[PDB]
Amino acid sequence: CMDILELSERLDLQRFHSHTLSLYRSVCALGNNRVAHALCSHVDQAQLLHALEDARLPGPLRAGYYDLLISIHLESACRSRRSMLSEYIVPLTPETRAITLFPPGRSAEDGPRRHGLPGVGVTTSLRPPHHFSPPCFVVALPAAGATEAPARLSPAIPLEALRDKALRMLGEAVRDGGQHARDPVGGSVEFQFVPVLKLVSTLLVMGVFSDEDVKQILKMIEPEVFREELEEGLLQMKLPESVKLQMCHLLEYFCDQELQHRVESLAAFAECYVDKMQGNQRGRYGLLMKAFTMSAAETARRTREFRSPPQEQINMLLHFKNGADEEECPLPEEIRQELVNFHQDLLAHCGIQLEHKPQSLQELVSHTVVRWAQEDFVQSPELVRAMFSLLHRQYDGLGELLRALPRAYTISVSSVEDTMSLLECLGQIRSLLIVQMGPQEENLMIQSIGNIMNNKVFYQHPNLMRALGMHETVMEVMVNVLGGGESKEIRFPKMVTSCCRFLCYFCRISRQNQRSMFDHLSYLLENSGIGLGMQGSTPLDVAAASVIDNNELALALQEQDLEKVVSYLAGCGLQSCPMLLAKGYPDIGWNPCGGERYLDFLRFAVFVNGESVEENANVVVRLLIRKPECFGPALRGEGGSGLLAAIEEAIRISEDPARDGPGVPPEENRVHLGHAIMSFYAALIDLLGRCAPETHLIQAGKGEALRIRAILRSLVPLDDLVGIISLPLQIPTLGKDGALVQPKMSASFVPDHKASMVLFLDRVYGIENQDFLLHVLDVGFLPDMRAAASLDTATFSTTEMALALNRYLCLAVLPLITKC
Amino acid sequence: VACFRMTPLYNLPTHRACNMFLESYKASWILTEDHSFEDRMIDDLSKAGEQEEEEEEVEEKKPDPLHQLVLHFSRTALTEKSKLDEDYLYMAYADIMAKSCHLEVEVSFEEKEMEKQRLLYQQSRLHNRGAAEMVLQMISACKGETGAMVSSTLKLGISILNGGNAEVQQKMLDYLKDKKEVGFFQSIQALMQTCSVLDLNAFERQNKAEGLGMVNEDGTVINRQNGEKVMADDEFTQDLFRFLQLLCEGHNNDFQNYLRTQTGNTTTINIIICTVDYLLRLQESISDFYWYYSGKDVIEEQGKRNFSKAMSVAKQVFNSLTEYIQGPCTGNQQSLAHSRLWDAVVGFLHVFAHMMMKLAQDSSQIELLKEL
Amino acid sequence: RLVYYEGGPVCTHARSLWRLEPLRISWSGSHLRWGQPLRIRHVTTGRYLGLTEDQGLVVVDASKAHTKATSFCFRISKEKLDVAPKRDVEGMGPPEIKYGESLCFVQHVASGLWLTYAAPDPKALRLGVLKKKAMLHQEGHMDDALSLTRCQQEESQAARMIYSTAGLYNQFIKGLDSFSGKPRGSGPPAGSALPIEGVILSLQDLIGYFEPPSEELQHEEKQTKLRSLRNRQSLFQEEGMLSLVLNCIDRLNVYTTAAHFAEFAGEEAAESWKEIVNLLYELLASLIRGNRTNCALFSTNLDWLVSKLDRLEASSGILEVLYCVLIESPEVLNIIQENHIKSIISLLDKHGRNHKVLDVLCSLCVCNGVAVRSNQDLITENLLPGR
């Protein structure tokens, strides 16, 4: 061994060891807490804390060890806190009520001229705490296998001691910089300042500094501006550009703290003001009720207010900025004056309200940035970008608050615990955006989604969730995984299935959520090119859920999206499924099982709330006829064998093994080709019948409606529908002294296939002649009703076939007979 | 039952009321507030300082802060990349720079000339620091992708070109001819092809959406939060064609010829013919929309608004063509003579005749008749 | 050997470039005129568009490219007015055809047929091909007119370089395969002579050609140079020079040392074996450096690269190639395996404390801000505990 300080002259060893430290950082980069714990064995806390103060280390090694400390112990916590720092969930507590824009002083009675020190005071915005685990290498290994144990936490390092040491080193650096010695720590001013400033910035963003610590940091930055009622601060020391970048990071943190203070003060004021408004309106309503028919017209003229939605009541009550009379806005003058005074205070705090010494953070930042740019032609593009971002924030104070408010939300005290738990889960999910998906990441993602679903707040505060952008994060994770290995099989089908269960419930939670997800329909449609491997839920299911039962969305649906779905369906109707071919299924020349999903999406797009949407229906019909291969091989032009013949052939396939499956099973053989073909044709007929025009339009005699009905009639003959409805079903039968011979629902002709044909017949052709009605009853309906009745015995009552027959009857057949 | 049912604000939970108040207050008080800081910011960034104390004898005086900002954005635009990532900083500073050039009884002749001189000085503060080159570089970098980046770039270009600034025109032309890049005109052509026109299917879908009315409390629900789907990018189309007109304004023969044939470039794009093509598309859309409204006795309010939007865009396009040809630029005159312009004129004449004869018979649409 | 009408990204590749060669040497650069006979040469392959009686429209070798078969002309219309002949002019002549503007019909002079597209047959639409076979027909169609677009000097030079380099390296590969398995014993090399000097010079020239721009250039010039470099790298890869270089490396890798190579090629040839292999690896690094597509090409065969890391003739070159691939391609990182990581660590074990191996290991962990937990864990578990 040698002294590590010999690496100042042994340059080859210095280079190798610095790159070794880089490798240490890389192997634990981006939240690998397990590898961080492992590295705590190779570079322990004593070594790290000694290197931090070692003033004789070469610059590369000093920087490497500072970065190693940050990477091992602070990086993941800092990153999670940074991710959470851009949202303001203010709990309505007494601490929140105590927050005010300006310190309770007397410098100026209104909008006290002097701000408070940035980052010093009370903040109530919810940020989840930090979690660390002691580094110990004698504990018993968790017997729990991999992908089951909880994710490791970052190794712990004494934070109060690290905080004190960081401040002391920063102070020493400032004094030495003032002295201007010829042997700077680390070999240069850059290697003396940049590491310490990185450590301090990381600790600030983590938010471990106390109020006294933050005050000391502020006095180090600028003794005069941040005095409280060496004289050379950091901002005036003729520093290199990298040190200037770190100073910009510090100033960014403090500006963000002032913005957070503004948002919290606004929320605290809003609580009291809205309470006063509510009391006012309650009193006014009491007086209105007391008024005994003073004038009925007058009573209506007041009461429309109370008939309007609360949002419009709020808007009406606040619409008095430029002046209004008691009729326009019933707020009393004192209530108005409170808001006017607060608005003046807010403008003053933002600096709107209109010295050679800055005397404020805004003036300090502006003057400093302009002075730097005036002094030198800055060469670092990162430094230039940071400088001008800071300058823009300082000049447009009100715009920053305006753009930050959309992410501000107020919650009641009773929701704080649940919101904190949900923030924990969301932090985990967000952290999964920077790591390549693996088994453990999949398990963590699934658990986070489950906790979020079981969390109460997820349902009660959908606006909060849209503001947090949970749907965007989950969608991004899903799309990353889908794109990864998209050509081959999609790994993590369980994770993608969860990617619906979450997003694809989230659409259902509220209509605004449905709008938010609808805004990404093309994205989901783009990524839904390949599926059906999941056997669960898919981005196509997300797309369908984003438009289901919403007329306003179905009308905003786009023709190019419909074209994408139609093209996918054409491809499915032209080429066999590669996954099935690999599994060994016989090649049939097309993909009924994917065509069925595409047809289901189109069905949800064209049929809403029991009524056809003509705009989408006409487009879909035109696209389907312009790509006839979508109709499937049966309805092909020349070689088409007809729908009835196709269904009969499908039945024969189903009864014939070695032509229905591999012939060599989580869902008991997954897909049976006979059932797949029947399901595809049933879905196609359902889609067409739903595209059929409405009866009122047909009676009105609209040319477009008549043309579409004629086209649908041409595609599907009546005889084919009647034949399919007349095809016989297998009925459960008793045999072998107790053996229930039940047909396999997933591999045979089921009543839903006939239900689709009944829908088409009712909506397109319609039953209008008694002879036809009697013929259909005699051949197709009555036998099925008789079978359903005969299955009423105790044994067969609850069989799958019996229940399917009951649903088929009561949803398709009996309503038709009732109508006719 | 909503008529009888009450939803007083005083029964709503406090936190929900706070969120509603924040949304309202933001929309009604903060958003309405008007702060004019752009001029102050640009003046502060343009002022250099202490150049005298350091007495730099290097004739290449270091760029002042505004110059450095423009250079940084030019760097970002020139960086080789697949696409132009959306940049809030660039948008904000482009908006600030654009607003810096204001372009604001009977004002006296001296007053008019003095406003003109202010505008020239304000535009000089920018184009003496590379703003024109930055605008061209960003338009080329957008690679024909519509978005806020290109919208801000076009607005900045218009801001520094307003009044037919000859110096800015010369700088832009010199930059284009020196760099000999096809990217600029390829991007312009792609944007012009992406520009939208009147869409009757979208109009009918919007009509049905409006006809639908939310049952539950509208404000509490989406409240039919539907934006204009018919010519939603009319502002962008007008900005694009205003930029092209401003390039040639003042009978600038050099741009009038360059917009037709880029001699130095390996491949040329005829922006005159691209403008004619867009005009033909717009004319066809307007004729379709008229035919839709032909039978109806009166035109409803949304129909009037859509006509007004389409007609403003058509007016801007006609102004751009006139600016292309006046001077006269014989090359552009021949190019338009051998184009599809005549068909567009024929369709416009048909629409004009029938729309005038119809709109005359009513008095609630005098404004539309005037605009026509 | 067949001609198609393709509309994908080939419109920017080198296999869509043709050179117009009038039937004359003097003033062959004169303004092209309507009806003037000329040959059309495929720049990259050096084959001439022509009409073989047995196969229709093809590209024939220069040796078989007689005027009757390979003479075409441009016409402004399909009307039969070629009766009037033309006389050679000793000068640039009158400008007749324009780039982009003029629309030209290609006609075979000897037969008079028109260059047109064949009728798309079924099952090709079904596969999804966007390429329509071109043919010579008596009538053709109405939209047979073609527009001529100039290609920049960069692509012209790159295409010609591709032609010459392909010829030279194919000759080299054939020479090696000549004595692949024929021990010379103590006498003649027993095979074709190797273009050693030409190969070395070509490799050096191409390395200089693909040399990255210096970091001291101003930003705009550096960006333009980078764009040019990416374009030229893509051109060479799309024409398959990457596969040719890999084939040459494969043939030269069979021999473990210069003496072993000499046992098959002779001492004179073996005197350049190490230099040639080093130059080939340097060229591969130059071709793939900074190019995500070229780097991602190695995902299918990464073992081919990792298995060569312990070769002692070109250790640094192979390591540089690996560094470029891993720095640019995340697809490779998603396929890295424990055996690959163990080989990279064995480089540290066997070659010494080289920080470039540490850089490679670092690049295996994170790429473009995304971390690969499997690689991180494997590196940790196989490198740290041993101490």
Added chain:
Amino acid sequence: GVQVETISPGDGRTFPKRGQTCVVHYTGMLEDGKKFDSSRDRNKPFKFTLGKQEVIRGWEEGVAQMSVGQRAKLIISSDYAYGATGHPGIIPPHATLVFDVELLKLE
């Protein structure tokens, strides 16, 4: 496994009893003599309760034989240590562990 060799004597009377909390300092080394862990480096005693299977069987069996205040060397075979699996990144598979353990107090 675990074999215990005294380094400094303890009181010799008070021994850990199941359920008690032992406070210790330790310095871990591989059988080669490579340090991999030390509570003294973190400057904080390690606390663990017997019977809860918090520490490996080697500690469980060894610390039980030490009196309060005693310093001793514990040599633990792989089977009583992390064994075949090996604490990845720290302890190689099938590694014998040598610890220098001082039992400060019981609580």
